[PDB]
């Protein structure tokens, strides 16, 4: 598949109310198999004690039709992006190379029998081992060589 007509950045504000508010950004919605997740995490409100933050690439295989749905989930990377406790106004850069994990492309409703889908899952862990997350779908595609 050639470069997509539209490739919007994924940008969102998320939080746990009055405890943690963050804006995260990933540079594209659609990445080729040897592409790079360039992004940032921005901290608006921090009232929890953060031990570390990681970015995960999760693969989901979805098999079957209608209520006959089996979902197999595999976690293909755990990439630490922050060590320690930030404060408000702090910006954490993300650079995650996909070439290190040998992913398959995104496959959607193949012959109406299965789907293989990829998710970026951002995980923050507190000092008492509590875990705060947000999942975002990303389309992986195989680049035609020139």
């Amino acid at each position: 598949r050639i470069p997509p007509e539209l490739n919007s950045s994924i940008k969102m504000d998320v939080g746990i109310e009055d405890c943690l508010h963050i804006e995260f950004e990933y540079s594209k919605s659609k990445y080729h198999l040897k592409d790079v997740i360039v992004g940032r995490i921005y901290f608006l409100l921090v009232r929890l004690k953060i031990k570390h933050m990681e970015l995960s690439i999760i693969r989901r295989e979805t098999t079957g039709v209608a209520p006959n749905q089996y979902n197999e989930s595999e976690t293909l990377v755990r990439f630490e992006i922050m060590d320690g406790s930030p404060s408000r106004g702090e910006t954490i850069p993300i650079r995650l190379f996909l070439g290190g994990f040998d992913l398959t492309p995104t496959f959607r409703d193949v012959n109406k029998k299965f789907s293989t889908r990829y998710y970026l899952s951002l995980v923050l862990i507190d000092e008492d081992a509590r875990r705060y997350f947000k999942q975002s779908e990303i389309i992986l595609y195989r680049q035609p060589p020139e």
Partner: protein, 244 residues
């Protein structure tokens, strides 16, 4: 040296079933105590030896204490736990007595801990073969309360039991809730309805579980500790009897 007596009670040579069978423990005294011959001895005492022994301590020390024994099968079965209690009970009994220089001085006990042949043959070998009223008040006062308190402690203990037992359904309720949930969710093919319904299975259970969990978490902790005191109390009950 006297408290600096080091004791491992291990090796649960738990003589296999008889419905009354008696665990034989290594008693390793590693002892820097100069109230114990061997810097290490291991003996392999059986329940009977100790109980007697415990009594011996009772016998050689005229009012001069003797804490609770090796654990009772009077509620015990033969459970690893029970035997552990015994092991412990000894450990404790022993522990203390060692950190009481006197009870630690019982010669039978030196020979006992520092020789395996049991208390008995040691015991032949060794003999070469306020006024009355307040105290009595006190005692009785004392007693009476601690009988009472005990009784509570049993009640409280029995309270433990309940809760844990009644991690009952509860468990099954929410375990089947989960299944139940699941049950129509499986009828429902309507996928996205199946999933939640099922999701509700997980939950109930997850929750169930958490609920289920709690006896074990907490209740049990208590039941143990409650029990413990009661163990002392029993033993001091003995303590008293000795005094009489």
């Amino acid at each position: 040296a006297r408290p600096t007596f080091h004791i491992t009670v291990g090796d649960p040579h738990k003589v296999g079933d008889l419905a009354t069978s008696h665990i034989v423990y290594s008693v390793r005294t590693k002892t820097t105590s100069k109230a114990y011959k061997q810097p290490e001895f291991e003996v392999k005492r059986r329940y009977r030896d100790f109980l007697w022994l415990y009594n011996t301590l009772h016998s050689n020390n005229p009012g001069v204490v003797v804490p609770p024994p090796p654990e009772k099968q009077a509620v015990g079965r033969f459970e690893s736990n029970f035997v552990e209690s015994r092991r412990a009970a000894l450990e404790k009994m022993l522990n203390k007595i060692a950190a009481h220089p006197t009870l630690q001085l019982d010669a039978d006990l030196k020979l006992f801990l520092e020789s395996e042949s049991f208390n008995i043959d040691v015991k032949h070998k060794e003999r070469k073969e306020n006024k009355f009223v307040e105290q009595d008040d006190w005692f009785h006062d004392r007693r009476v309360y601690l009988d009472a308190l005990e009784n509570q402690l049993k009640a409280l203990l029995k309270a433990m039991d309940n809760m844990v037992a009644q991690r009952k359904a509860m468990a099954e309720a929410a375990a089947d809730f989960s299944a139940s949930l699941h049950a129509l969710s499986t009828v429902e093919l309507s996928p996205t309805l199946s999933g939640p319904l099922d999701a509700l299975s997980e939950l109930q259970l997850a929750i169930r579980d958490v609920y289920e969990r709690q006896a074990q978490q907490d209740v049990l902790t208590f039941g143990i500790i409650i029990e413990e005191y009661i163990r002392l109390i029993g033993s001091v009950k003995q303590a008293f009897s000795q005094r009489q």
